[PDB]
Scaffold this active site. Structure first.
Site, PDB file in Angstrom:
ATOM      1  N   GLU A 184      23.032 -20.328  -4.981  1.00 43.41           N
ATOM      2  CA  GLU A 184      23.196 -21.737  -4.633  1.00 43.41           C
ATOM      3  C   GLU A 184      24.655 -22.155  -4.731  1.00 43.41           C
ATOM      4  OE1 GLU A 184      20.370 -24.243  -6.514  1.00 43.41           O
ATOM      5  OE2 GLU A 184      21.403 -26.113  -6.008  1.00 43.41           O
ATOM      6  N   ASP A 216      15.256 -13.294   0.242  1.00 48.50           N
ATOM      7  CA  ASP A 216      15.685 -12.581   1.438  1.00 48.50           C
ATOM      8  C   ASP A 216      14.977 -13.151   2.665  1.00 48.50           C
ATOM      9  OD1 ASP A 216      17.390 -10.839   0.037  1.00 48.50           O
ATOM     10  OD2 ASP A 216      15.720  -9.495  -0.439  1.00 48.50           O
TER      11      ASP A 216
HETATM   12  N1  LIG Z   1       9.240  -8.227  -3.275  1.00 47.62           N
HETATM   13  C1  LIG Z   1      10.190  -8.507  -4.161  1.00 47.62           C
HETATM   14  N2  LIG Z   1       9.888  -8.469  -5.480  1.00 47.62           N
HETATM   15  C2  LIG Z   1      10.850  -8.755  -6.365  1.00 47.62           C
HETATM   16  N3  LIG Z   1      12.119  -9.088  -6.148  1.00 47.62           N
HETATM   17  C3  LIG Z   1      12.390  -9.117  -4.833  1.00 47.62           C
HETATM   18  C4  LIG Z   1      11.508  -8.847  -3.808  1.00 47.62           C
HETATM   19  N4  LIG Z   1      12.138  -8.973  -2.579  1.00 47.62           N
HETATM   20  C5  LIG Z   1      13.367  -9.306  -2.879  1.00 47.62           C
HETATM   21  N5  LIG Z   1      13.585  -9.418  -4.227  1.00 47.62           N
HETATM   22  C6  LIG Z   1      14.837  -9.772  -4.879  1.00 47.62           C
HETATM   23  O1  LIG Z   1      14.981 -11.170  -4.812  1.00 47.62           O
HETATM   24  C7  LIG Z   1      16.386 -11.503  -4.752  1.00 47.62           C
HETATM   25  C8  LIG Z   1      16.629 -12.343  -3.527  1.00 47.62           C
HETATM   26  S1  LIG Z   1      18.324 -12.962  -3.488  1.00 47.62           S
HETATM   27  C9  LIG Z   1      18.205 -14.436  -4.519  1.00 47.62           C
HETATM   28  C10 LIG Z   1      18.781 -14.268  -5.902  1.00 47.62           C
HETATM   29  C11 LIG Z   1      18.533 -15.476  -6.807  1.00 47.62           C
HETATM   30  N6  LIG Z   1      17.129 -15.939  -6.687  1.00 47.62           N
HETATM   31  C12 LIG Z   1      19.471 -16.609  -6.404  1.00 47.62           C
HETATM   32  O2  LIG Z   1      18.976 -17.570  -5.807  1.00 47.62           O
HETATM   33  O3  LIG Z   1      20.649 -16.484  -6.715  1.00 47.62           O
HETATM   34  C13 LIG Z   1      17.134 -10.169  -4.757  1.00 47.62           C
HETATM   35  O4  LIG Z   1      17.478  -9.804  -6.086  1.00 47.62           O
HETATM   36  C14 LIG Z   1      16.078  -9.215  -4.196  1.00 47.62           C
HETATM   37  O5  LIG Z   1      16.310  -7.867  -4.533  1.00 47.62           O
END
Ligand SMILES: Nc1ncnc2c1ncn2[C@@H]1O[C@H](CSCC[C@H](N)C(=O)O)[C@@H](O)[C@H]1O
Ligand SMILES: Nc1ncnc2c1ncn2[C@@H]1O[C@H](CSCC[C@H](N)C(=O)O)[C@@H](O)[C@H]1O
Lengths: 207, 206
Positions: free
Chosen positions: B187, B111
């Site tokens: 991706e 994020d």
């Molecule tokens: N502090 C945190 N601890 C764990 N997961 C987290 C987080 N902050 C965000 N996330 C999670 O991390 C993901 C980011 S979106 C990316 C999704 C995956 N890595 C991809 O590349 O397809 C989401 O599922 C979000 O809920």
């Protein structure tokens, strides 16, 4: 009509003996405004623009190719800028031309990428040249780098990191990231037309 | 409420990870290096890297249980036994791993939290950089790829400020030939429209 006697006639813009003024470049300008230098001033459109943009900074451009520094002296002649000198010398001579701390910033624009592995040592962002910049600026200096070349920029970022320098600014698309006061280089104008992103970094020494 | 398939698959989704701090080699049965992904998503990445590299122990963490369930299912469909999953927040990492127990951390399309007041929520912010140092020691690295120009630009500065060494950086991952690259769910989506995917590797100085 090859013109080299042109550079002798405009020896007030193109300093034909810059080593004499090492440590004494403040006398060359007449004031103690900070001296910013550009290591590859090909055609001098940038250095001229930055001079007109910033009258309170003393600009010294360096160029190795004499065929193209001639164009640079003409742009400085036309812009009527009095805070621009130009040196037809190689970057390796920096420590013969400036004493430590005499330079405050270094500008690198669209330098030769030298893609092959054997020519890393010729790249202007290689640790050899990173040392030359440290030796003329001290640790109170910074480098302002812009280039179109993904390869050279990717390498330069690692090279800066390896040398231990701090990244204070980085754009991966300069003409979509609003930068106030940006003077485009000749190479910048052409690759901007081509719709290719222009990368920019600011790197400075830790103290 | 209810609707949790996690209790039946408690061998992939560890429901009590704090118990295993310092003892994760017993959880796997070997001293292969432990690589962790923060923000796993639907699990496509972790599963691919596991099948590709059977001699590495992968632990994925996800905060939203609605989506980690899909991740356990992908690990269920693949026959990989070197994948555990944690439904936890990245903050509890220091309650789950002893220093040096983790060898690498994977960050994929995290994020971006673009506005300044939520800088502190970014997974590449100095707070988390410390948390990673605290679980990896100085022998660790971070492998980050994202589509977001803003987040990548920030992360590079954040790494530099924290003092990490940049050993790899791509500003176009699908034009820079990377051999072992497993694509994430996000991706594949941002690869459409030809948006560039940025990648960096950063490791601690010694
Ligand atoms: N502090 C945190 N601890 C764990 N997961 C987290 C987080 N902050 C965000 N996330 C999670 O991390 C993901 C980011 S979106 C990316 C999704 C995956 N890595 C991809 O590349 O397809 C989401 O599922 C979000 O809920
Ligand atoms: N070691 C060195 N010392 C001085 N100039 C150098 C150099 N290596 C390369 N150059 C010059 O650096 C320039 C880079 S290409 C031109 C860049 C210019 N800023 C522009 O954007 O238009 C070339 O003119 C090249 O001859």
């Amino acid at each position: 009509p090859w013109a080299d006697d042109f550079l002798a006639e405009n020896a007030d813009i193109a300093i034909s003996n810059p080593a004499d003024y090492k440590g004494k470049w403040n006398t060359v300008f007449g004031n103690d405004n900070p001296i910013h230098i550009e290591v590859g001033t090909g055609k001098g459109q940038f250095i001229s623009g930055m001079a007109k943009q910033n009258p309170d900074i003393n600009y010294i451009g360096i160029e190795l190719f004499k065929s193209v520094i001639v164009t640079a002296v003409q742009k400085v002649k036309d812009s009527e800028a009095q805070n621009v000198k130009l040196l037809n010398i190689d970057a390796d001579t920096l420590t013969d031309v400036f004493e430590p701390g005499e330079v405050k910033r270094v500008y690198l624009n669209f330098s030769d990428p030298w893609p092959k592995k054997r020519h890393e040592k010729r790249r202007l962002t290689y640790s050899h040249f990173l040392k030359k910049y440290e030796e003329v600026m001290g640790k109170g200096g910074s480098i302002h780098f812009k280039t179109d070349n993904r390869g050279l920029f990717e390498y330069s970022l690692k090279s800066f990191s390896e040398y231990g320098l701090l990244l204070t600014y980085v754009s991966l698309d300069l003409h979509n990231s609003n930068l106030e006061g940006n003077i485009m280089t000749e190479y910048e104008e052409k690759f901007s037309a081509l719709g290719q992103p222009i990368y920019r970094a600011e790197v400075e020494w830790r103290t």
